[PDB]
Symmetry: D2
Subunit: 445 residues, 4 copies
């Protein structure tokens, strides 16, 4: 009636209820119907949301993801649930099971990767487990014994195979690998993608989300799906992608995440007496990718740019990815103040028409802005959580607190929406999105 | 470490996580392994715990229970999950599917009943739904349209077939129907139960709860199972039970619950324009069973007595059932003050060695008291919730608040135990008990 | 910013801060400037607000008020702070210090009374005290020893001298005695108050509240001050008032409060072994005023009417006072259901334009409704509190909870306003009103 | 009863109640009786406690303290309340009003200083103000205009006159200047303080705190009062003190606080466009005292040592002061990990007998440990607050949260004790200590 919002305990309960309801047994779908499988960075956030509920189950979630890790160390961005249809492109379209020599034998996966937030989830599990007593600590420590080597191979694959020239930035061969499918970041790179004979297909996502304004266009999907054909043609061989892919970009937000994840994992390695050589490698990558992020930055505002490897051009756009350097640190004092000022001012969090004091995925004042259209504008709870947690790690306690507070206010409708209209607060995308519930559980758990 | 307790939001989240994890699809088990099926009054409490999470799902829970209602209106106390073993006595032992003309054709059920808390659950669903907007109200109202007639037949079966002499008290033919299997209330009646040739059997409950001190003895189970043979021999025919059952008691706590449920359902019937004749019948039963409860009461303390129909003897014991008249009202002012004084004084809630200010199932100062032994002493969260809610309905706001507060303190370990040791607070019985989580969700939802 | 509301902990802190700030030492002013003295029922609510902060200091507040009790038992509605100006009519205008033979020697007081909510304060103090342990229980019990007789003398003067005919309704000689100075309730009785030669005066209330739309008019104050002259002329003699006063009305809301207070004080007397004859009188008065209230109600809707004793005429108006019978009980079942339907429906809490689900002081559909004008429309937090507490005492747990939740939502701005605009929620009247903070403290304390 | 703790809302309310109760008008006493005046760093913490209640009043508190600032910039550690006795040494014993040419004309003050936590208060005021809207931001910004110069003069006197050699550590001439009067830190410097003819005196502190185990000894007060005589003899002349004082120590904890304060005030200056030269000085001092602190640490464990300037000797003791470098930063990575391991291990927060996971003022395994004796062992809520806030500023979000959670658990008794027994949790020292309430208000405000 007069106020449709939930109290903190009611909201925490519905968040946990949601998360258990998306559990298939050993994996959690990223949403009920739109994403009926395990997505890689979603699964790290699900593990974070599970840690206040069951350390054992949170560990299971990462165990399931890491059991799908490729032989060369890549964590694919989708681990498909057996027998489940309703997401396209599904296992048959990817054909990694028949074409990818490195794909796991016991799991169906996609053929591309996604950002390495996984060490952050590991840290949250360890922190929860240390508050829960000896037996729970044992569970978390046993997971480190089992999986430390796999997490290293994951970070090592990114540093060695997606940063071949040691530039300190991660090359993507698909926009899906950024986690921001249709970001304006990738428009000029996608304009150079020219599909050949693209095998017929039928989208599934817009059968579930029928409002065309909330999802990418058919033309975008044509390009998404053609890049799959380019990878398939070389059997997903790492060595051949630089020669054949029509899409090759350095992703500065992915890179900043990687810098933070390496430092987090390095600290975990020290605390739990992992091999010194590993910790040394992790610190080395943390510093290399921090520097690689800073090298992209605008000299006036500190804003980070992506880089189009094929066009050899800095990609200048007005999305939340510009704030990559706030995540990993490294800007000189004066430029970081400039970047925080851009973040808080009227092009982003301080825009006068915003319902909440939150970061829109694209600036409302950019010509690229579309208030409903996926990564072209809407406010994403997963980004609110990531910025808030990284800001607290920088020591910006009040800044982190304000993002968390506004994020809880936006989530208090209980829709657990994928993303929200920046001006009206209308829930968009899939309802009951697992990583939105997990953001809420962490903020309250 | 220094404090093992959960915060209110953490506790609400783990409670909801638990409840969803016990959901088989359309029914919720009463516990993970000890009770791997739907129990009747457990299911009313599960519906209460689900109402803050999903009005639709709470309604489903009662729909599933009412679809197992017998043709004469009895709600059996177990609706068995198809294919599930591990509880004894299971469907084969009861044989209601082959012997009971009134048993439903599409469900496997037990052959006995359990207390009618169901209207209370309906009230909580309606109250939640009225705070959630038109579409949710529609869901709750549609359930009333579908099931009002079935709830009436349920109350009518109790009033007509378990109160044949219109004494205002409910006759039980099995201690399991009281929900307090091994209460000292039933010891002298069970002493008159003499098993004949009892078919061989093997207990399942104490394979799961192996500590013999927490469950009934083998001798008790021999008597529990023999009464099944007496019912089976007459094909569970209502008309023949008075002639053949070795166990026939009037249960004053069940009766007080029934008086309250009739009044609650009558009020619901008025609010939602149900047939006047039904509402009139409900008020008539509410008054008859209130009076029947008061007639049992001790002239000095107000304590309610059960009645052994076969022995024609008042059953005088010191259990929490003595406080039946506080639930339904009706004592003269002076005797209700006496009864509250007994409740709060040193034989019950004010006993000096109690960890919490809560009602033990048997008085610690009774010779019958056993601190670990099921209904012989332990503190039960389900009873804390029922007394607290009934006390608030009497207008005793502070008394209800204090019970709720102590109950949340006891539950804050997150074990969601079936019952608790009264002195040490050790969790006993099954962990992850659904109606304990539901008590917590209601108190916080 | 985006959300200027306070959290529960911030709101509780600021409420306590305010209350201590209005403390002159042994008395708390009702507001900092508009009401710079102790008012009688404000003092009862202040004591309720202090009980979670300090039982000792809550007890002092009632001790101070009763030290001003008149020799015949009347508690005057204002106890003036020594040396403080700024409220008119002040002590020189009342002249009780020289005219009133019953007024106390050691305090400057007014010459009229106010509603007897004091017993409710005493109950809240006792409930807090019993949760604080032995030393604090001693404080509250010693207060009962010191002041039980004065509280009896208070209730007895009401029953004997303001209900001379034993009608079970309290007679008032001034609208100020109802606490609802300019309620539409009193308009037709005030229209027959014809002031003669009224000594010159200058208002102070509208120097502090300058917006004329929020206070009574000059013409209304002329009548308020004239009744003062009629009282002074007979030296405030109880025996003379019914022959000279141009204003004589039976106040059904005051009467309902009195019935509740007697029942509450009777129960306290039974708990703490007070004289039997006092408890017996108290129960007798509770019943007599319960019936007197019921006698006034519309036999269809249950709405309570005031009565103009001089016109010998029932006063039919649409204010919150119509709901008096919900406070004290006693209506036939059908009549009370109809009155609840009036409360919850579109003439009161269900009005579609209300910002909160709260009771407006006057029905928005009434010809008399003024959304800003004191008791002619605004929502009063003190009434929300009283209705919610009385509702919980009737056993209407959800109705009480709903009012409390909306009241806290309304108070969450931290203005602690005297009253609020019903449609926009604008804080009106005085800011920093002591009984608004006390309502918040109790709902959260 | 069973649980005598307060809820968060009750605790926040009582904390605010206490703080307003210790307000004399423009200053708040540090305790009601033991410290019946304004102390300098207590006033900083009081301002922090007031910021959620009233930015205007928080600003008044710092205005009052700075109105007592000495002409050379020193903030004295006591500003005496006019006409109040009961603390010794009082203003007649200090005689700054006649001896001290730099002492203010309008205030009676002490003649020594205390740690510069004031900038942190200013930051908390500003953060609260920016969440309250335009009018409240104006108040806080107008305070910065009025008082920026006085805060600069404060930091500059510390840097120029208590660090004459530019060593990056603050020199003290009295143990009272450290805030840790009887810390084992100062025992070996005090052993070389040989009082000559000391004028007769009578302690007041141990009339109010009568238990001798909780306060310093007579022999210790003889030395505290003797240093007073040495100061008075040179009329508190900065230029003369290093030639006469029998007590001269570099205080590494005070020094760390100073480095943090300079960095915090530098950032404030950048945000509010203060003179560039001031911000530059402030950053220079932050760095210089950061390094001065690091210079003192054990190269293996990181523990910070004080320095006795007269003995020319590092002071090695096991108190909470060893953790100074965690506040300001600057340690090499390995050294800081070792110091954190010392903090969390069995010599401090990990000691197995501690009731709470909190930092004891002296290590329980130290020969010097006394569990009741002021700074020789007890747990101090003001230190918990300072460590938790500085930890959060380092980006150690979980470490800060853990301290805050345990601090609130400890404070939940509502005693607001000065300090607590580390093993049993007994409240010790003064009850109703203003900076203990302020820590609670901030952690919940």
């Amino acid at each position: 009636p007069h106020d449709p919002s939930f109290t903190p305990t009611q909201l925490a309960a519905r968040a946990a209820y949601l998360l258990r309801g998306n559990d298939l047994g050993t994996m959690t779908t990223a949403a009920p119907l739109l994403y009926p499988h395990m997505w890689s960075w979603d699964a790290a956030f699900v593990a974070i949301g599970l840690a206040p509920l069951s350390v054992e189950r949170a560990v299971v979630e990462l165990d399931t993801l890491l059991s799908a890790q490729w032989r060369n160390g890549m964590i694919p961005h989708i681990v498909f649930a057996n027998g489940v249809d309703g997401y396209f492109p599904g296992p048959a379209r990817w054909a990694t099971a028949t074409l990818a020599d490195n794909a796991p034998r016991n799991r169906l996966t996609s053929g591309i990767t996604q950002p390495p937030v996984h060490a952050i989830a590991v840290q949250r599990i360890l922190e929860h487990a240390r508050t829960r007593g000896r037996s729970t600590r044992a569970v978390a420590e046993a997971f480190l014994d089992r999986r430390w080597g796999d997490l290293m191979r994951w970070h090592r694959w990114l540093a060695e195979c997606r940063d071949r020239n040691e530039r300190g930035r991660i090359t993507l061969y698909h926009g899906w690998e950024s986690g921001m499918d249709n970001s304006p970041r990738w428009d000029s790179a996608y304009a150079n993608v020219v599909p050949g004979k693209l095998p017929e297909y039928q989208r599934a996502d817009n059968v579930i989300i029928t409002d065309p304004s909330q999802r990418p266009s058919d033309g975008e999907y044509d390009r998404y799906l053609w890049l799959l054909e380019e990878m398939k043609a070389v059997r997903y061989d790492d060595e051949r992608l630089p020669s054949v892919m029509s899409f090759q970009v350095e992703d500065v937000f992915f890179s900043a995440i990687f810098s933070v994840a390496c430092q987090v994992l390095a600290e975990i390695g020290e605390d739990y007496k992992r091999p010194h050589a590993d910790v040394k490698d992790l610190y080395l990558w943390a510093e290399r990718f921090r520097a690689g992020v800073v090298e992209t930055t605008d000299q006036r505002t500190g804003a980070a740019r992506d880089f189009d490897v094929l066009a050899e051009k800095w990609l200048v756009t007005e999305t939340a990815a510009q704030f990559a350097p706030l995540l990993c640190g490294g800007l000189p004092h004066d430029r970081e103040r400039a970047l925080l000022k851009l973040l808080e001012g009227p092009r982003f969090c301080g825009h006068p028409d915003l319902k909440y004091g939150l970061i829109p995925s694209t600036s409302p004042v950019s010509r690229d802005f579309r208030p409903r259209e996926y990564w072209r504008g809407p406010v994403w709870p997963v980004l609110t959580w990531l910025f808030s947690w990284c800001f607290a790690r920088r020591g910006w306690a009040e800044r982190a607190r304000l993002l968390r507070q506004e994020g809880l206010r936006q989530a208090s409708d209980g829709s657990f929406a994928e993303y929200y209209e920046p001006f009206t607060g209308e829930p968009l995308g899939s309802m009951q999105q697992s990583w939105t519930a997990a953001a809420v559980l962490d903020w309250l758990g």
